Amino acid sequence: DPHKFFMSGFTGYVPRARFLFGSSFPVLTNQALQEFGLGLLPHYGGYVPGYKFQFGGTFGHLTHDALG
């Protein structure tokens, strides 16, 4: 549905402009108008429950069940 944006530099009102951030003006404006209309990694720095029921297998084969 092209040509559905305001030109960059537009001063007049555009709805929902103040709630969608982080970009330049027409790429904000097109979405503003569309709105207006297996195993875990070893040496892991994190948490995995299922920590304790283990003996004698590698990390990926242990955490494959925890991811699935």
């Binding site: 330049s24 875990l40 070893p42 040496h43 892991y44 720095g45 994190g46």
Partner: protein, 430 residues
């Protein structure tokens, strides 16, 4: 044979290295899950199975920014032990990184680096992706740049770092912390990529029309400024250069060793169609003060050396005339002991914009590297803050607590007094 290992330290080095090593897997044909469906051995190794594995180090002393990488995004790319983690963050001071918490894995950065040092037939330098304002990026970096010069030494040094801005500030007492690395760099540095945040919330607000930007709007551009430096080993061209070649020019004295950076052609995805994108314009777009990557005006100071590296469709005869336009202008000035003061390298490949990105698919690119003596005026205001705190002696109380005596403090002034003195001596008419 033209190998390079560059290091990442801090909160930034994983996050900047998220978007630096985004591109070196994208420039080549490399899938993120280790495969490719020659000159790819500059930023990669090779396994006989076929899997491609990179080589660089990631340090942060709490696991989650490295557990950002270790989770589902980039699992099969990196080596599982070039992602090493502490268990507690060094937390805004030099002490926990350099002295206490680093020791249980500073001999884990050095059994990987040296094992990756001795699996390269060539090497050219050590380059650092770290952060001045931290407690890891100025703690664990100066546990490694002071320590490799004991071992390796005469090899080249460069530092892609993040500098304190003039007006915008993130932490509170970090101006005092900044001077805990200008003690150590000035005796063991040969390059410095000083970068603030306020100047790329404005480069991204003038050239791009992005008011109010974020880090991933920002960090993908630092991932570009490195790749027009390492382009020459990675891809061929008309005039290929090497990592030891630019340092032969860019450091003039034992005390003027501080260049800058500038990515010249930068524009949105819209204005480039109405833009001509000429060689004669993106060579004198570099010099205007609103294109510097730090908040510095290059009028009141001088230029020492100028390094240029091109990309894509560049013929040299208009570059040889684009320079001769500049040196007859006199809004910029030069010192009288450097009559040559220029360098140009050229490659054949054009740039690559990331999918879903915020820049234009251009067939040209320019990087401007400039030693500037007006950085002295920039180093005036940051270290002017030291006098307003040391009179009232704020926070020296916990500074002395974990292993840094006051000897660090006295030396730091007497380094910056002589560092601000020689920049006066270099600009005078002889």
């Amino acid at each position: 044979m033209r190998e390079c290992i560059s290091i990442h330290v801090g909160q930034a080095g994983v996050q900047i290295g998220n978007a630096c090593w985004e591109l070196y897997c994208l420039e080549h044909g490399i899938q993120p899950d280790g495969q490719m469906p020659d000159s790819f051995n500059t930023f990669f190794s090779e396994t006989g199975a076929g899997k491609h594995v990179p080589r660089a180090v990631f340090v942060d002393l709490e696991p989650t920014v490295i557990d950002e990488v270790r989770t589902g995004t980039y699992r099969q790319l990196f080596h599982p032990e070039q992602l090493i983690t502490g268990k507690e963050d060094a937390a805004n001071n030099y002490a926990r990184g350099h002295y206490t918490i680093g020791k249980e894995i500073i001999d884990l950065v050095l059994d990987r680096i040296r094992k990756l040092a001795d699996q390269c037939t060539g090497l050219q330098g050590f380059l650092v992706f770290h952060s001045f304002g931290g407690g890891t990026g100025s703690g664990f970096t100066s546990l490694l740049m002071e320590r490799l010069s004991v071992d390796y030494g005469k090899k080249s040094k460069l530092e892609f770092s993040i500098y304190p801005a003039p007006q915008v500030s993130t932490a509170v007492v970090e101006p005092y912390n900044s001077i805990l690395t200008t003690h150590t760099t000035l005796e063991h540095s040969d390059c410095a990529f000083m970068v603030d945040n306020e100047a790329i919330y404005d480069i991204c607000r003038r050239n791009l029309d992005i008011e109010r930007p974020t880090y991933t709007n920002l960090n993908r551009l630092i991932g570009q400024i490195v790749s027009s430096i390492t382009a020459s080993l990675r891809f061929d061209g008309a005039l290929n250069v090497d990592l030891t070649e630019f340092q032969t020019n860019l450091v003039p004295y034992p005390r003027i060793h501080f260049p800058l950076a500038t990515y010249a052609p930068v524009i949105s995805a819209e204005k480039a169609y109405h833009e001509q994108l000429s060689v004669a314009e993106i060579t004198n777009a570099c010099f205007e003060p609103a294109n510097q990557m730090v908040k510095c005006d290059p009028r009141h100071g001088k230029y020492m050396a100028c390094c240029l590296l091109y990309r894509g469709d560049v013929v040299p005869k208009d570059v040889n005339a684009a320079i001769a336009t500049i040196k007859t202008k006199r809004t910029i000035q030069f010192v009288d002991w450097c009559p040559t003061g220029f360098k140009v390298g050229i490659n054949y490949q054009p740039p690559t914009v990331v999918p879903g990105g915020d820049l234009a698919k251009v067939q040209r690119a320019v990087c401007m590297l400039s030693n500037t003596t007006a950085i002295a005026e920039a180093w005036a205001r940051l270290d002017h803050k030291f006098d307003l705190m040391y009179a009232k002696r704020a926070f020296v109380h916990w500074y002395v607590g974990e292993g840094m005596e006051e000897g660090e403090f006295s030396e730091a002034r007497e380094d910056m007094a002589a560092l601000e003195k020689d920049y006066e001596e270099v600009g005078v008419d002889s």
